[PDB]
Amino acid sequence: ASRLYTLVLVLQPQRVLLGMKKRGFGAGRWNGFGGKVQEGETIEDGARRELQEESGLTVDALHKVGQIVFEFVGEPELMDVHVFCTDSIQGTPVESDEMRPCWFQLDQIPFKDMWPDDSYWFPLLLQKKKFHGYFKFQGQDTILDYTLREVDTV
Template identity: 60%
Template sequence: MSQAKLLTLVLIYNKPHILLGMKKRGFGVGRWNGFGGKVRSDETVEDAAKRELLEEANVTVSSLDRVGVLTFEFDGEPELLEVHVFKSQQYEGLPQESEEMRPQWFHEDCIPFDEMWPDDVLWYPLFLEGKKFRGHFKFKGHDTMLNYTISEEASALD
């Protein structure tokens, strides 16, 4: 395995509502997800998360809480994806559709897991409970999860 590619995922969560985006193009197209993407070489993980949120949903956040780190392995692919998951309750701006994402609010009891990545149903409960977590997921293609581990983390995630 090569070094992991760093990615971000931001979820705006104002209990009981969560802002998700329908991915319109690229990796994950046709699925509801949080907002995020690749970390550029000249930015921190948190700066990348803020930039991606602005680009994809037209909202800004002043602070983010890192709540999870998820590693994804795809059978036959040498590169791991390391996704840093952030939560924010405070944001500025009105969520607006971009070329890449169509934002929509969901009640926490109506999250569309059947239209999301298969791993989401496993770690979202920890997220919704305000817990920190770490997980590793191995996929065959983009729809079949071969195995996974997930754990609650008591301390800070780095």
């Protein structure tokens, strides 16, 4: 039993856009933009909607780069996250109620203030390799189990 999520990383030659989560689950961490997929929208629709709602940006093209399943101890639903990549954006990123966006040089990604799983799978994203991941959390800090592989088809 899974629930669909989207995660969008704006990745330009020298820099990546991240958003500081301001409230709710995972507040205080930087992450890509995304969230729950709603009924009546494609997964990629959901990804553009979340990217716009949280950063003001729209995009010409989103590219599927990964899928990650998250389990949390004691939580019935799993997160089935579809990860997207884009370089060309439309607009300038602005703060939302949810997310404060900031650019980061690729050698200054704030991994210690990001979700732990990102340290595992961000490198594959940075190499523009497609991947499948699984991460079992206990709470929001401890990864009990994980798998990670490159794929031909996300």
